């Protein structure tokens, strides 16, 4: 029940699924979302302790950058503001 | 406060960074996250005018280096009542 | 009034700025905000012909350097009742 | 009438203008406004053959310079029954 | 008949012309019209192989100069049963 | 089987051709067809690893020259439990 947030955005769903797979395999993080953003952007989101989310996002970024049209963003917010939480499925 | 702050980004990840930075930057409420179509994503905040100013300014600085980056950073100090349904 | 003002933008932030400038410029009611697809957004107002013209001029000026800017500014003074379902 | 007239535009604003000019130029009824994706908008009218011919032409001239403009202007005087679910 | 015919266009208007020519060409049933996203529109038909052959040929010819035109024209004579839910 | 196969295409017609060729080339089941946005279409199959491998290989070859063609062809042999909700 760490509250760190890990995010990877990709071009297309296939690199996003690869990313989430690699993230949840690399460390103890829970997948909490997959968003079809519009325009072809897809974002996957995970939660965990800071160290695990760090390891997960590095792993996801590495795994998906060469899949399909690839990686757009790979970002960690280690302590999201309470206001941000509804955007994360709360 | 009824002042409105808005940041538009390319993709969701810079939008969440913007929202985080905005809400840590000053006393503002995150009231909206919009998938606009075509990859645009907008986040909206409300608060007193001075707070919304600092929030949007921190928001723009934070998300402009994230993902496909920043499109718009804007403030409306006194939004018309007619606009409220769209918020 | 039954006159129609429309502004189309690239992104939601210029649309919201347009809608605010429009409703502040004259006695016009904001009747809608449409996410068109591909990033197009359109805001619609109704009022008397002169009011609507003032409103759209103001909204076109206000939003053209906001975010990815302005696509269309258009006024239909007396819409056909066939079109009203689209409004 | 059962003739079908179609105009496709980039953005919603020229679609509404096309629809308004179409329904003013001849007795035709607006039966549809479709957000197609990517920013395409299609407006659909029905009526007698001559009406629909007059309508589509007028709609094409009117919306041609509005916003990001006109994509398609087309008439099918008697759509096959199998086409109706695709409108 | 289990043969499958498919035409993909840029915009709805060429897709409707494709549909009309396809379904008038031979005895096929229009099982779908999909808004794919980004402006792609796909129309799908079923019938016996000869009918679908004739249909898809007719449709490709008719729509390729209409609007932003034709993307794809394809026939699958005997689709796998696993694909049927997608159909 | 629990291995996952995925082909991503531009448009629905190459996607359906992929799906057909995948399920004909090996014992895999088609679990999904997703309209991703912007015109991306993903088809997803499950099966044993060797089968999913043969399936995606064939699907990639089959759809690459169809319509606007192929974007991605990827296998995940042992998908994490956490990924299952996205499938």
From Swiss-Prot, chain A:
The keyword Protease does not apply. Coiled coil: none annotated. The keyword ATP-binding does not apply. GO terms for molecular function: structural constituent of carboxysome shell. GO terms for cellular component: carboxysome. It holds the Pfam family BMC. Its main location: other. InterPro entries: Bact_microcomp_CS, BMC_dom, BMC_shell, CcmK-like_sf, CcmK/CsoS1_BMC. Keywords: Bacterial microcompartment, Carbon dioxide fixation, Carboxysome, Photosynthesis. Residues 4-89 form the BMC domain. It is found in: Carboxysome. PROSITE patterns: BMC_1 (PS01139), BMC_2 (PS51930). Transmembrane segments: none annotated. One of its GO terms (biological process) is carbon fixation. It comes from the Bacteria. The tight homohexamer forms a pore with an opening of about 5 Angstroms in diameter. Homohexamer with a small central pore. Forms a CsoS2-CsoS1-RuBisCO complex. One of the shell proteins of the carboxysome, a polyhedral inclusion where RuBisCO (ribulose bisphosphate carboxylase, ccbL-ccbS) is sequestered. Assembles into hexamers which make sheets that form the facets of the polyhedral carboxysome. Belongs to the bacterial microcompartments protein family. CsoS1 subfamily. This is Carboxysome shell protein CsoS1. It comes from Prochlorococcus marinus (strain MIT 9313).
